[PDB]
Design an enzyme around this catalytic site. Structure first.
Site, PDB file in Angstrom:
ATOM      1  N   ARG A 107       0.821  -1.207   0.000  1.00  0.00           N
ATOM      2  CA  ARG A 107       0.000   0.000   0.000  1.00  0.00           C
ATOM      3  C   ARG A 107       0.859   1.262   0.000  1.00  0.00           C
ATOM      4  NH1 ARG A 107      -3.170  -2.831   4.778  1.00  0.00           N
ATOM      5  NH2 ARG A 107      -3.100  -4.310   3.033  1.00  0.00           N
TER       6      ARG A 107
HETATM    7  N1  LIG Z   1     -10.815   0.192  -3.882  1.00  0.00           N
HETATM    8  C1  LIG Z   1      -9.520  -0.180  -3.757  1.00  0.00           C
HETATM    9  N2  LIG Z   1      -8.592   0.195  -4.663  1.00  0.00           N
HETATM   10  C2  LIG Z   1      -7.302  -0.172  -4.546  1.00  0.00           C
HETATM   11  N3  LIG Z   1      -6.831  -0.929  -3.540  1.00  0.00           N
HETATM   12  C3  LIG Z   1      -7.653  -1.377  -2.563  1.00  0.00           C
HETATM   13  C4  LIG Z   1      -9.077  -1.016  -2.620  1.00  0.00           C
HETATM   14  N4  LIG Z   1      -9.663  -1.575  -1.548  1.00  0.00           N
HETATM   15  C5  LIG Z   1      -8.698  -2.237  -0.863  1.00  0.00           C
HETATM   16  N5  LIG Z   1      -7.502  -2.117  -1.463  1.00  0.00           N
HETATM   17  C6  LIG Z   1      -6.238  -2.720  -0.976  1.00  0.00           C
HETATM   18  O1  LIG Z   1      -6.501  -3.369   0.268  1.00  0.00           O
HETATM   19  C7  LIG Z   1      -5.643  -2.893   1.306  1.00  0.00           C
HETATM   20  C8  LIG Z   1      -6.494  -2.399   2.466  1.00  0.00           C
HETATM   21  O2  LIG Z   1      -6.077  -2.989   3.692  1.00  0.00           O
HETATM   22  P1  LIG Z   1      -7.031  -2.872   4.983  1.00  0.00           P
HETATM   23  O3  LIG Z   1      -8.056  -3.978   4.925  1.00  0.00           O
HETATM   24  O4  LIG Z   1      -7.477  -1.435   5.101  1.00  0.00           O
HETATM   25  O5  LIG Z   1      -6.040  -3.193   6.208  1.00  0.00           O
HETATM   26  P2  LIG Z   1      -6.598  -3.181   7.716  1.00  0.00           P
HETATM   27  O6  LIG Z   1      -7.647  -4.267   7.725  1.00  0.00           O
HETATM   28  O7  LIG Z   1      -5.378  -3.484   8.551  1.00  0.00           O
HETATM   29  O8  LIG Z   1      -7.148  -1.786   7.886  1.00  0.00           O
HETATM   30  C9  LIG Z   1      -4.799  -1.770   0.734  1.00  0.00           C
HETATM   31  O9  LIG Z   1      -3.415  -2.121   0.791  1.00  0.00           O
HETATM   32  C10 LIG Z   1      -5.226  -1.620  -0.709  1.00  0.00           C
HETATM   33  O10 LIG Z   1      -4.093  -1.779  -1.568  1.00  0.00           O
END
Ligand SMILES: Nc1ncnc2c1ncn2[C@@H]1O[C@H](COP(=O)(O)OP(=O)(O)O)[C@@H](O)[C@H]1O
Ligand SMILES: Nc1ncnc2c1ncn2[C@@H]1O[C@H](COP(=O)(O)OP(=O)(O)OP(=O)(O)O)[C@@H](O)[C@H]1O
Ligand SMILES: [Mg+2]
Ligand SMILES: [Mg+2]
Lengths: 489, 464, 47, 348, 49, 49, 50
Positions: A348
């Site tokens: 990310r």
């Molecule tokens: N709409 C989207 N566009 C691009 N990447 C996404 C999208 N939704 C999720 N991701 C990917 O999923 C990951 C989100 O992780 P997340 O579930 O927020 O972690 P946590 O559960 O620890 O908060 C990001 O690294 C991102 O790259």
């Protein structure tokens, strides 16, 4: 003069009477030269867990206090040394003189003290730098199963810093720390020899915890592994740290908790594992300009059984960390040595710190790879356009294969990425690709080496340089021959 | 007047008092650490009685370097939080002091953090159609203005991106004062949010409270109470609309479990503690909107090990009115919103409130999805040839609907670099009616992927 | 010929499903064993 | 200077000692049963200090017929076993007594069994491929000097032939020896193996140690410890390569778990002792290569109902280096040396 | 135990004996019950040490 | 229990009543919690006797 | 003395009462019902289960 005596001597736990004035987590001395730490107090006794060997101690022994909290010596002389978690020289190479002490339990910097990451951290593995960019100060996860070749990735990343060290600029120099928990001594000797071969052993410090020792060392290894990097943090340097495996120390903590008579949770795991893993992975930080800057890039490794990503510890670590990289053993058995699944591997934070030339030389290869995967899935049972697409996908997939060690620098990495992405090697048979992808590079190192100079200086590819190298490779493909390969002409 | 520490086993501490000076069941005590390297002043909260003028208490700071026999003093009142107008535009911790300026806010008026919930007479149900430019939320689970909304997720499923999307969608046009809380997160998102709101010209309006995962569990059970006190003050007196954001209540539950185990009490089940539901309800019953006052709240919850049967999420599930769930399978399929229609519900979905237009379309869509889920097994084992013609066309349009349900995001510019879009409700209703009737049979599936409005779908149709 | 190809594909689709089911059953059995042993030891030492 | 017995429940025994004379851990003690027809002597080892001069210990032979308040003496040193060049061609038990001829080996030199693995510096950062005269294994699954080789699937396809083949090959080509250790042994199988080896004229240049299946827990570990002690004594002083045959690695762990449960410590996931990894690591790291000498080993393993994710096989596989499979079809085809090339692989 | 004791006297006199145990699971259950009635640390399935 | 008592009192005068219980799982869990807080041995799957 | 089973699958399927006739019984049965309902209804539950 405050002397105590052991009342009961359990297997891995001891109880001491007397000694009224003792601090929490204070270090205790034993007549055999072994040391203990006290974690539970009472109006009648004090509990302690023994570190190292415990068969020497027994009931009725004399105990003296050291008057110091849990701490590790630290200095600049640790470079190029092999040490146990406590801090004594395990090898006979000689003695070490430190400069100061560091407490293991120190709070991390708050939100205001942090800083965004913008400086890329290069690695020799070209299969991930173009795929999953990494930046210093940003954490990454390596997860897989047994016999997939991940320690090789770690040692290549360690070895890649030779040019940066020889540059001599303190802002560019990067130190390294390696730890090993519950590993066979032969592997430790082999990796030490391999590092010595590359001439990178001088700027590295390794902490060893063998598989034949007690639980205390397996529990304490990461703390003393990260303390030195923490000390080097506040002087403005940049630090890299690798954790060989976190599962073993979790198992050791479970064992010690069970020996301490604590009710269990899921599969006998107590609920305190998340706290300690969070502490370890949150100690790292990217400092701001006010404090001086630096990095604590950490690369822990986790092993899984039968590709069980929905387990307890893997999910906890995935939640804690930022990104992850996945290694598939089925692909490993097919000879693809850099076996990383592009399907689930993602970062990310990465992408902002990547070189702009690197960001524009690789034109969205992710969609091409996914398209190739679905195309071969469809064609398993079974179009000229589809044929060309699958041929290009096969060439691209075969390109990423890399031999053991040989960490490539940025210049040849971007050159190879340009060669593949542009559409070269379409007429070249796959079987003769690998050597070709080497030999041309060597010629570029001999003739027209000024091309690498532009990439070193401006970190972008210009029109004149790109057309010159296009002409050079056009004048080189006719000079190379294969058993079944001929020049495109 | 002064007590003695008798045993220290970690975060929990036991202290003895002279006769007649034992404190109340909730109170604050002070102690100090005299070691040179880690000199601090620590605050203790009384937890329970033990008889013989002995009380068991917890701590708000790490206990390293503490020695028995030290002196403790009693404040006489529960802990306090500096509350008042103008505290917005700053970041704080659980104790209350500002991070940037240590002396800031010392002169304000202080409240308590333990307060009874409001009486039953003032409670009043409310149903209002909140609108967000998203297809999945508008069609399936509409939100409410005065209710509580929850986001159930697994690990690495993209829930944080959804939180950023929600704050971007709602905080822009709000006229009231917002408040955000953080329970056991990682500071990278804290810095990201701070810098992102810095140039949004909204930070002046909102106050922030931060409690992270590096702190001992004792402090991981109080930031929610502090944020609730701030919201209570802003709602009761100033009479303004209040918005509340809360992340990872599951971390609060875990901290409660750990501290209960340390206190010493027989575990209940699956390694948990008794009276978890009592604490959960005691916390969750204070976020209510009366008939003359309003407050809205959005919370995020994390499912451990992808087990939806675990007591920790099961107990909290029956205190909501509009829930959404995310699944690993849809995430692997490539649908970034990754919302499962068959496990999300809203209370206000009925012809009386929403209207007769939405109801039939939603029922038809859910029926199609259920039929597809039923047939998926035979689809997997053999293929699509064994089915009849009508079932084949049902499967086809079910796949079309499933693929179309994804929408291009707003906060994904960091990753995709493709600007997002927002859609009015009527366009969604008409598009889904047409899809159910099946006027897009000849179109390829790839077109129904992160397109937003149907006009963009028509434009992308000829792009292939 | 088409029947031959389809039937081969069906077998190659069934085998890995069997493997996945076996793995799930094994993990479920281990979880059950751990659950009852934890319950009985807790009941025993609660006295 | 002599203790007494306080509690006699089960195999475990609690002993009381005077002040200042409590023995250390892993120390030997003797107690003789003189009542009734079933008279014998028992050996005990210190297991844990309970405080107030109380020691909890585990017996070696059944504790039937013991009486409270009896007298007990302590050797002062750990369990000792005789070693030498004359120990081969004779059967031995865990305690060192010679079943074939009682009183044998009393004048030999005795060593302890609790020993430390070598230092880190002595390890050699190299991998040497051990070669032999068998072209079956060299081309596909080469062996490694000082490593571990997994073997399972006997099923009466002639694995004893493989064992004697290895014995004679190391006897001739390399001038080595061989040590055989049995953890859980059926008496008839052991007797048949002894008779077959005697008929094969290979008892010389081969030591044998057996641990009977019907025995109180405690022997099932000490048999392996004693076998390793003899093997390392052969390696070091004689300076000549040895090969160790250890079978039945499985119920070694079961015996350990049984002892742990008897001591009363809390169990772990899937009902196991919480310290299995340390014990298995100690046993595996016992063997190594140094000073140009080495100890290769072949082990027989048994999976718990084909669940490779079980803790015991998962812990075991962390140290193996090569796997050999015994098939029941190649020999039916007539290929007398039975292997499964497709099911066998090596990391080398 | 008494069945085997009866058989062994003849078996030590150059005579062949065949002994049948009708069941053994109930023997294990009885032993488990008699162990649990007094103080015995329980392992898997509450079985004794 | 109070609803049951009210229903009984309206029963014994000759009237007719109908009682509705919201849920019995919640009160069972409350009983489990209150029993477990008291020092009483736990039962099968944490539910006391 | 009788049980009624509601499953979410039937409710999703489109049956608003959302009750399955397979495992829903009543001890009293026809005794409670008025006689006219008894003759009109008959054994409809068994036919539905079949
Ligand atoms: N709409 C989207 N566009 C691009 N990447 C996404 C999208 N939704 C999720 N991701 C990917 O999923 C990951 C989100 O992780 P997340 O579930 O927020 O972690 P946590 O559960 O620890 O908060 C990001 O690294 C991102 O790259
Ligand atoms: N890029 C590569 N090129 C050639 N050989 C490779 C490469 N990567 C791995 N290998 C080979 O694969 C094996 C990797 O062994 P390695 O010790 O790294 O395993 P692992 O997956 O890290 O697990 P473990 O920690 O259990 O050993 C070695 O045999 C090594 O030679
Ligand atoms: Mg490896
Ligand atoms: Mg998330």
């Amino acid at each position: 003069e405050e002397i105590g005596t052991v009342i009961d001597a359990g297997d891995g736990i001891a109880h001491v009477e007397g000694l009224p004035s003792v601090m929490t987590q204070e270090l205790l001395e034993f007549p055999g030269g072994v040391l203990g730490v006290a974690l539970n107090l009472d109006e009648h006794s004090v509990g302690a867990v023994i570190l190292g060997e415990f068969e020497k101690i027994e009931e009725g022994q004399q105990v003296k206090r050291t008057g110091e909290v849990l701490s590790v010596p630290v200095g600049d002389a640790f470079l190029g040394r092999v040490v146990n978690p406590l801090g004594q020289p395990i090898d006979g190479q000689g003695d070490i003189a430190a400069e100061t002490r560091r407490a293991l339990e120190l709070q991390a910097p708050s939100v205001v003290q942090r800083q965004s990451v913008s400086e890329p951290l290069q690695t020799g593995i070209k299969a991930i730098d173009a795929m999953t960019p990494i930046g210093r100060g940003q954490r990454q996860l390596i997860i897989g199963d047994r016999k997939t070749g991940k320690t090789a990735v770690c040692v290549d990343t360690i070895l890649n810093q030779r040019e940066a060290w020889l540059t001599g600029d303190p802002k560019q120099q990067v130190r390294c720390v390696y730890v090993a928990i519950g590993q066979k001594g032969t592997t430790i000797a082999s990796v030490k020899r391999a590092l010595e071969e590359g001439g990178a052993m001088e700027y590295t410090t390794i902490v060893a915890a063998p598989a034949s020792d007690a639980a205390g060392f397996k529990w304490l290894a990461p703390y003393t592994g990260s303390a030195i990097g923490q000390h080097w943090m506040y002087n403005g340097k940049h630090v890299l740290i690798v954790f060989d495996d976190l599962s073993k120390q979790a198992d050791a903590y479970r064992a010690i908790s069970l020996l301490l008579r604590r009710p269990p949770g899921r599969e006998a795991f107590p609920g305190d594992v998340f706290y300690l893993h969070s502490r370890l992975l949150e100690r790292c930080a990217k400092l701001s300009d006010e404090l001086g800057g630096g990095s604590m890039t950490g690369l822990p490794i986790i092993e899984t059984k039968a590709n069980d990503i929905s387990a307890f510890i893997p999910t906890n670590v995935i939640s804690i960390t930022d990104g992850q990289c996945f290694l598939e053993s089925d692909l490993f058995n097919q000879g693809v040595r850099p076996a990383i699944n592009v399907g689930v591997s993602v970062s990310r934070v990465g992408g902002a710190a990547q070189i702009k030339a690197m960001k524009e030389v690789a034109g969205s290869l992710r969609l091409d790879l996914s398209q190739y995967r679905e195309l071969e899935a469809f064609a398993a049972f079974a179009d000229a356009a589809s044929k060309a697409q699958l041929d290009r996908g096969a060439r691209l997939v075969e390109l990423l294969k890399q031999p053991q060690y040989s960490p490539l620098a940025v210049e040849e990495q971007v050159v190879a990425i340009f060669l593949g992405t542009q559409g070269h090697l379409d007429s070249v048979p796959v079987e003769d690709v690998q050597r070709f992808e080497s030999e041309l590079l060597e010629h570029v190192k001999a003739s027209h080496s000024d091309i690498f100079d532009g990439i070193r200086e401006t970190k972008k590819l210009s029109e004149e340089a790109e057309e010159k190298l296009v002409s050079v490779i056009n004048e080189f493909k006719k000079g190379f021959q294969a058993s079944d390969g001929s020049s495109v002409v | 007047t002064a007590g003695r520490v008798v045993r220290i086993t970690g975060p929990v501490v036991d202290v003895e008092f002279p006769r007649g000076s034992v404190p109340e069941l909730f109170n604050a005590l002070h102690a100090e650490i005299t070691f040179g390297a880690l000199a601090k002043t620590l605050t203790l909260e009384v937890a329970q009685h033990l008889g013989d003028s002995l009380v068991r208490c917890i701590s708000m700071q790490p206990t390293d370097g503490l020695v028995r026999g030290v002196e403790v003093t009693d404040t006489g009142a529960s802990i306090s939080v500096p509350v008042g107008d103008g505290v917005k535009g700053h970041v704080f911790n659980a104790l209350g002091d500002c991070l940037d300026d240590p002396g800031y806010g010392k002169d304000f008026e202080h409240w308590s953090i333990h307060r009874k919930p409001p009486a039953f007479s003032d409670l009043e149900p409310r149903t209002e159609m909140l609108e967000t430019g998203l297809k999945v939320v508008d069609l399936l689970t509409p939100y409410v203005r005065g209710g509580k909304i929850a986001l159930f997720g697994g690990a690495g499923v993209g829930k944080t991106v959804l939180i950023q999307e929600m704050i971007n969608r709602i905080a822009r046009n709000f006229g009231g004062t917002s408040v955000f809380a953080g329970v056991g997160e990682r500071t990278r998102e804290g810095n990201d949010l701070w810098v992102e709101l810095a140039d949004a010209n909204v930070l002046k309006d909102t106050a922030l409270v931060f409690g992270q995962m590096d702190e001992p569990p004792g402090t991981r059970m109080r930031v929610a109470l502090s944020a609730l006190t701030m919201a209570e003050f802003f709602r009761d007196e100033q009479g303004q609309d209040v918005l509340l954001f809360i992340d990872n209540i599951f971390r609060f539950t875990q901290a409660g479990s750990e501290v209960s185990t340390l206190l010493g009490r027989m575990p209940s089940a699956v390694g948990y503690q008794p009276t978890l539901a009592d604490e959960m309800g005691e916390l969750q019953e204070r976020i209510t909107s009366t008939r003359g006052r309003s407050i809205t709240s959005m919370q995020a919850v994390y499912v451990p090990a992808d087990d939806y049967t675990d007591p920790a999420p099961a107990t909290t599930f029956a205190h909501l009115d509009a829930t959404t769930e995310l699944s690993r399978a849809v995430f692997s399929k490539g649908i970034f919103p990754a919302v499962d229609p068959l496990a999300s519900s809203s209370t206000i979905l009925d012809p009386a409130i929403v209207g007769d237009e939405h109801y039939r379309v939603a029922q038809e869509v859910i029926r199609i999805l259920q039929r597809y889920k039923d047939l998926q097994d035979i689809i997997a084992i053999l293929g699509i040839d064994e089915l009849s013609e009508e079932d084949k066309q049902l499967v086809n349009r079910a796949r079309r609907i499933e693929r179309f349900l994804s929408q291009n995001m707003m906060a994904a510019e960091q990753f995709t670099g493709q600007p997002g879009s927002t859609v009015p409700l009527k366009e969604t209703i008409e598009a889904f009616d047409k899809l159910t009737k099946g006027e897009f049979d000849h179109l390829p599936e790839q077109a129904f992927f992160l397109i937003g409005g149907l006009d963009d779908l028509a434009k992308k149709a000829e792009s292939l | 010929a088409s029947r031959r190809r389809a039937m081969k594909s069906a077998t190659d689709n069934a085998d890995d499903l069997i493997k996945a089911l076996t793995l799930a059953a094994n993990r479920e059995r281990q979880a059950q064993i751990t659950q009852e042993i934890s319950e009985i030891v807790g009941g025993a030492n609660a006295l």
